[PDB]
From a paper:
The predominant form of IgM is an asymmetrical pentamer, with five IgM monomers joined together by the joining chain (J-chain). In this work, we present the cryo-electron microscopy (cryo-EM) structures of VAR2CSA, TM284VAR1, DBLMSP, and DBLMSP2 complexed with human IgM core. In all these structures, Fcμ–J exhibits a pentameric architecture, with the J-chain conferring asymmetry on the central Fcμ platform, as seen in the complex with the secretory component (SC), i.e., the ectodomain of the polymeric immunoglobulin receptor (pIgR).
For example, VAR2CSA, a major culprit in placental malaria, can bind to chondroitin sulfate A (CSA) glycosaminoglycans, resulting in the sequestration of iRBCs within the placenta. The 300 kDa ectodomain of VAR2CSA consists of six DBL domains plus the interdomain regions (IDs). The IgM-binding sites in VAR2CSA have previously been variously mapped to DBL2X, DBL5ε, and DBL6ε27,28; however, our structure unambiguously reveals that DBL3X and DBL5ε conjointly mediate binding to the Fcμ platform. DBL3X and DBL5ε are located distal to the CSA-binding site; therefore VAR2CSA should be able to bind to IgM and CSA simultaneously. DBL3X and DBL5ε together interact with three Fcμ units within the Fcμ pentamer. Arg2059 interacts with Glu525Fcμ2B and Asn529Fcμ2B. A VAR2CSA heptamutant (VAR2CSA-M), K1238A/D1279A/Y1282A/R2050A/P2055G/N2057A/R2059A, failed to interact with Fcμ–J, validating the functional relevance of the molecular interactions described above. In contrast, preincubation of this IgM with the ectodomain of VAR2CSA greatly reduced its ability to activate complement-dependent cytotoxicity, with a half maximal inhibitory concentration (IC50) of 1.9 nM.
Residue numbers in the entry:
A (entry chain J): 3 to 69, 98 to 136
B (entry chain L): 345 to 444, 449 to 576
C (entry chain K): 468 to 569
């Protein structure tokens, strides 16, 4: 019976405007919008940049996500950044894997 | 011998993607095999009326037609006339009609709570706060298929109080009370000239109505990277 | 920027109605509200309908304004009925917030 209005994965939100029938008598049925949000509490400010500050503030204006300052890594998407590496004095760029679990070659 | 001409209305072409053309010259006596013309001043061809009886039983009829013009002709804005001759007036009678913008404002409102409380019927209205020009058309949808004409009524435009240049209207559908009680969504597809797709569709349902309860869980977890 | 209020009138067989708006108990200017002609109801031709659209500033509607409506018509027991709406005219809309900290 749930109608999942929004499932934005950056600003994790699961607004479900599920209708609930009231008791045995209809015509007073209640409508409820369950904004289930999972604040990460640990993700960095610029989530793709690990060296950025920590998120001490989480704005969830529901108007924007109904229709970006990304917070939570999406399952399918891979967030990564280049890293410097030194082995014998050579500084070689290479891509990283900030979410290795979902970033296997597929 | 009333003489009048019906200009093509863009409201009509959005409904059927076709142009129906017939001039209107009423209150003329009986004429056998009536044949009337339609020639814009720069020389379009002549066409007679169709699907109109040449002599109605009442003897006070209107037998005069318009040539089938494409929508591009009215997009051009050229002039147009029906020239009518009959026994009553040998002198031909000619009348000239032509078309003389802002994004339409189309947001509807749901039924009141007390309407559903009465448990008799319900009223859903496709209010339009403002549009330009005046011409506009409203049609109601259900389950993606057109609704019957008898249910919905469309009101003519009125000038906006603070923006007399802007014009507003409304349409009403008297739907059953119990039908609205269940989750059946409707769309009041309107038709306006000043639109990108030339047609606007907006829908509502009980799920779109006023909510009461909000049990936002707003979970806070150290599990940060993965969503849910 | 603005607020639109529609006063639904439904079911006057005499087909004669005159709507007004009395905001804070005094009638408002006629030009503010515009009413529709009494065309027959779809469900029952004997019945008719009309609206009244009062455009007002959004902030004013957001600050405790009654925006009362009246209907002058014969069949009513006192010949007049009044209705009004504000922020809280609807149902209470209790919240159910939860805040898990696991
Ligand atoms: C900081 O956030 C910005 C976006 O707000 C991002 O910067 C760019 O992200 C794209 C995405 O692939 C990269 O290709 C660019 O190289 C980034 N910019 C620069 C200057 O490198 C990114 O999320 C964050 N920036 C960095 C450097 O990680
Ligand atoms: C919302 O209220 C209902 C009772 O109406 C209750 O069962 C439910 O647990 C509440 N939601 C919460 C606490 O998230
Ligand atoms: C919100 O309330 C409904 C009751 O209608 C309940 O079924 C649902 O589980 C609640 N939300 C959560 C996250 O438990
Ligand atoms: C909270 O939600 C509603 C509103 O007060 C109430 O009916 C319900 O029993 C409450 N439940 C919890 C777990 O707080």
């Amino acid at each position: 019976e749930r109608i999942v209005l929004v499932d934005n994965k950056c600003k994790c939100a699961r607004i479900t405007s599920r209708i609930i029938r009231s008791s045995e008598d209809p015509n007073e049925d209640i409508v409820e919008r369950n904004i289930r949000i999972i604040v990460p509490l640990n993700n960095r400010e610029n989530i793709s940049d690990p060296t950025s500050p920590l998120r001490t503030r989480f704005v969830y204006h529901l108007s924007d996500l109904c229709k970006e300052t990304c917070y939570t890594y999406d399952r399918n998407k891979c967030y990564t950044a280049v890293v410097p590496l030194v082995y014998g004095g050579e500084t070689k760029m290479v891509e990283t894997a900030l979410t290795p679990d979902a970033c296997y070659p597929d | 011998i009333r003489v009048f001409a019906i200009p093509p209305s863009f409201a009509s072409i959005f409904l059927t993607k076709s142009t129906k053309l017939t001039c209107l010259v009423t209150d003329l006596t009986t004429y056998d095999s009536v044949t009337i013309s339609w020639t814009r001043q720069n020389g379009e061809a002549v066409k007679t009326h169709t699907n109109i009886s040449e002599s109605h039983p009442n003897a006070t009829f209107s037998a005069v037609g318009e040539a089938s013009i494409c929508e591009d002709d009215w997009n051009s804005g050229e002039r147009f006339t029906c020239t009518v001759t009959h026994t009553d007036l040998p002198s031909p009678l000619k009348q000239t009609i032509s078309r003389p913008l802002h994004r339409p404002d189309v947001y509807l409102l749901p039924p009141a709570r007390e309407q559903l409380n009465l448990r008799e019927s319900a009223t859903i209205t496709c209010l339009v706060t403002g549009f330009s020009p005046a011409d506009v058309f409203v049609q109601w949808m259900q389950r993606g298929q057109p609704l019957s004409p008898e249910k919905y009524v469309t009101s003519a435009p009125m000038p906006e109080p603070q923006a007399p240049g802007r014009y507003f209207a409304h349409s009403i559908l008297t739907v059953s009370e119990e039908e609205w009680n269940t989750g059946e969504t409707y769309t009041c597809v309107v038709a306006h000239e000043a639109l990108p797709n030339r047609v606007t569709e907006r829908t509502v349902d009980k799920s779109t109505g006023k909510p009461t309860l909000y049990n936002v869980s707003l979970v806070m977890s150290d599990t940060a990277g993965t969503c849910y």
